[PDB]
């Protein structure tokens, strides 16, 4: 059906400090030489309230993509705290990995991210202003939400 199929996503350096870059080791396979590059994005949801707080941590092209099975590490910078609503800073949100071909998204892998203080003192009494230097990010890598879209591969 679709020329590209994602075989697996391994979440590296997890858990880790909120400031560390996201590191995904992706494995996907191409059923037939693509004429263009694949475009991958890592999107962090600052708040579920509005998409207006989505942060595209990074956008990269992968290519060339000859038919076969392939693997690469998609690394991106940690979101900018200054753009994250205080109330959504500590707790759970989501981070998305999407892939698009010829301007059309065909796959999207969402993960829940849990940002908590490891320091029991702070966990008991969280500061009004979230302290991201002391936050730990735990990508819940066991339960990935995979959504596939039907696009025109030409």
């Amino acid at each position: 059906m679709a020329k590209v199929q994602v075989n697996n996503v391994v979440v590296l350096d997890n858990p880790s400090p909120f400031y560390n870059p996201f590191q995904f080791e992706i494995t996907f396979e191409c059923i037939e030489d693509l004429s263009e590059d694949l475009e991958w994005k890592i999107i962090y949801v600052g708040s579920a309230e509005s998409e207006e707080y989505d942060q595209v941590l990074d956008s990269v092209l992968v290519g060339p993509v000859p038919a076969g099975r392939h693997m690469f590490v998609f690394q991106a910078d940690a979101p900018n705290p200054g753009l994250i609503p205080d109330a959504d800073a500590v707790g759970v949100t989501v981070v998305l990995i999407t892939c698009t071909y010829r301007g059309q998204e065909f796959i999207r892998v969402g993960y829940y991210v849990n940002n908590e203080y490891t320091e029991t003192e702070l966990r008991e009494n969280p500061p009004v202003k979230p302290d991201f230097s002391k936050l730990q990010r735990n990508i819940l890598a066991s339960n990935p939400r995979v959504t596939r879209f039907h696009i025109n591969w030409e």
């Binding site: 080791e25 494995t27 590059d37 990074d58 956008s59 990269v60 092209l61 992968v62 290519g63 060339p64 993509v65 000859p66 076969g68 099975r69 392939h70 693997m71 690469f72 590490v73 998609f74």
Partner: peptide, 21 residues
């Protein structure tokens, strides 16, 4: 990996050339 090859597209975009399995 991270012996991974990345270049810039003709128009300055980041591009990773994947490893073949």
């Amino acid at each position: 990996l991270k012996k991974q090859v990345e270049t810039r597209t003709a128009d300055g975009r980041r591009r990773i050339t994947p490893l073949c399995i």
